[PDB]
Design a protein around this ligand. Structure first.
Ligand SMILES: *[C@@H]1O[C@H](CO)[C@@H](O[C@@H]2O[C@H](CO)[C@@H](O[C@@H]3O[C@H](CO)[C@@H](O)[C@H](O)[C@@H]3O)[C@H](O)[C@H]2NC(C)=O)[C@H](O)[C@H]1NC(C)=O
Ligand SMILES: *[C@@H]1O[C@H](CO)[C@@H](O[C@@H]2O[C@H](CO)[C@@H](O[C@@H]3O[C@H](CO)[C@@H](O)[C@H](O)[C@@H]3O)[C@H](O)[C@H]2NC(C)=O)[C@H](O)[C@H]1NC(C)=O
Ligand SMILES: *[C@@H]1O[C@H](CO)[C@@H](O[C@@H]2O[C@H](CO)[C@@H](O[C@@H]3O[C@H](CO)[C@@H](O)[C@H](O)[C@@H]3O)[C@H](O)[C@H]2NC(C)=O)[C@H](O)[C@H]1NC(C)=O
Ligand SMILES: *[C@@H]1O[C@H](CO)[C@@H](O[C@@H]2O[C@H](CO)[C@@H](O)[C@H](O)[C@H]2NC(C)=O)[C@H](O)[C@H]1NC(C)=O
Ligand SMILES: *[C@@H]1O[C@H](CO)[C@@H](O[C@@H]2O[C@H](CO)[C@@H](O)[C@H](O)[C@H]2NC(C)=O)[C@H](O)[C@H]1NC(C)=O
Lengths: 96, 99, 49, 50
């Protein structure tokens, strides 16, 4: 009995043009493109590349050679998995 | 930011109460399928590319730049040695030419 | 109030600009989401594996 | 119902890569406003004309 109180005084609300499903589709498409292509999909046609090789190039882009990744891939994957898992615990807490 | 793609240069033009930019960009085209490997083992040592990728056309192995297909013979000046052949997941046996 | 409708007509156009401003705000609100999210012309799919 | 775009799928694999063999030069435009009209209002004539 809150929206009707304002509606009965000539104060309406219009729905957004894009629904939630379309925004979810956009986000999923962006994630899939980033995972399977890297940055090539943002400058033309998408070109596939293995994820480890893409991570090696990303390390090379910040001044660290790729052999570091090719030798610490397992540790890096474990650290990334733990960091992602901690985000769920952080968000699910009452402290919003 | 300056056009879509890989920016090269821009040209300004004047408009009434405004301005118009002409962005020149670089767009790749006509891609092809290749087989790739992260490293190559020659004599118990792992070789990594310097500024390229490892590709194969089916029988042989080459090294080429990442933005334009230009195969070249794998040579000790194209690769650097770091480690052995039992720490890399996906290493491929091949030979490295000595110039 | 049928009389108030006639009385308010003596104040000129105090309703057209309000409606125009609100419509512009709504259009800008749609344009914001279109600019932020609609950045890809293709809908990619993740592999089954 | 509006369509978000064309469906596509990327052929991801353990060992596969795509390398372009040609390029295209593209020129695009972009328009940005800079300034607007300068206006002046005279109170005496507008409010109390003569
Ligand atoms: C993948 O790339 C390699 C690059 O070396 C290709 O090997 C080369 O293939 C060409 C085409 O057949 C060979 O040229 C031929 O040589 C023979 C003998 O000299 C000559 O009689 C023919 O008329 C022709 O010119 C070339 O020798 C060969 N090079 C080597 C080192 O083997 C290979 O064919 C490519 N594979 C695919 C599937 O494209
Ligand atoms: C690249 O080349 C290396 C050698 O140049 C290959 O190493 C191979 O490793 C296997 C491991 O199983 C060796 O097999 C051996 O078989 C004997 C048979 O009795 C067994 O007693 C040993 O315990 C061992 O299992 C194999 O001999 C060895 N190759 C050579 C030439 O010695 C490697 O597999 C090649 N490929 C890759 C992806 O590294
Ligand atoms: C990379 O792409 C360019 C186009 O952006 C390719 O150049 C094009 O090549 C074709 C065939 O060689 C040309 O078609 C022919 O043009 C002649 C011109 O007199 C015409 O008489 C023929 O009937 C035929 O249409 C096309 O004109 C040409 N485009 C340009 C802008 O020059 C180039 O070949 C590609 N590179 C590779 C390695 O594939
Ligand atoms: C590289 O190879 C892959 C798989 O062999 C190609 O992907 C296929 O493309 C055809 C296009 O006619 C589709 O019908 C298949 O469904 C695709 N397969 C998969 C698994 O997606 C890909 O097109 C090749 N690259 C190029 C540039 O042609
Ligand atoms: C190759 O790709 C597969 C899947 O795309 C990777 O995962 C393997 O999949 C097979 C198929 O059932 C399983 O038997 C393996 O156990 C999977 N591997 C792991 C580590 O779980 C696979 O790792 C990739 N690499 C190789 C060398 O196969």
């Amino acid at each position: 009995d809150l929206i009707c109180a304002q509606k009965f005084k000539g104060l309406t609300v219009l729905p957004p043009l894009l629904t939630d499903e379309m925004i979810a589709q956009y986000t999923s498409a962006l994630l899939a493109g980033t995972i399977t292509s890297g940055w090539t999909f943002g400058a033309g046609a998408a070109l596939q590349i293995p994820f480890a090789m893409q991570m090696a190039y990303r390390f090379n882009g910040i001044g660290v050679t790729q052999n570091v990744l090719y030798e610490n891939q397992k540790l890096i994957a474990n650290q990334f998995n733990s960091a992602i898992g901690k985000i769920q615990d952080s968000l699910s807490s009452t402290a919003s | 930011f300056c056009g879509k793609g890989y920016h090269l240069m821009s040209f300004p033009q004047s408009a009434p109460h405004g301005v118009v930019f002409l962005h020149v960009t670089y767009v790749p085209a006509q891609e092809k399928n290749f087989t790739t490997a992260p490293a190559i083992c020659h004599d118990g040592k792992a070789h990594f590319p310097r500024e390229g990728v490892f590709v194969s056309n089916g029988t042989h192995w080459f090294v080429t730049q990442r933005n334009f297909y230009e195969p070249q013979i794998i040579t000790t000046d194209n690769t650097f040695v770091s480690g052995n052949c039992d720490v890399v997941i996906g290493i491929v046996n091949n030979t490295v030419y000595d110039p | 109030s049928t009389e108030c409708s006639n009385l308010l007509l003596q104040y000129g156009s105090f309703c057209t600009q309000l409606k125009r401003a609100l419509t512009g705000i709504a259009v800008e609100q749609d344009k914001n989401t279109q600019e932020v999210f609609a950045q890809v012309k293709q809908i990619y799919k993740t592999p089954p594996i | 119902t509006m369509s978000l775009g064309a469906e596509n799928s990327v052929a991801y694999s353990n060992n596969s890569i795509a390398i372009p063999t040609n390029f295209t030069i593209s020129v695009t435009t972009e328009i940005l406003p800079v300034s607007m009209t300068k206006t002046s209002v005279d109170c005496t004539m507008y409010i109390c004309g003569d």
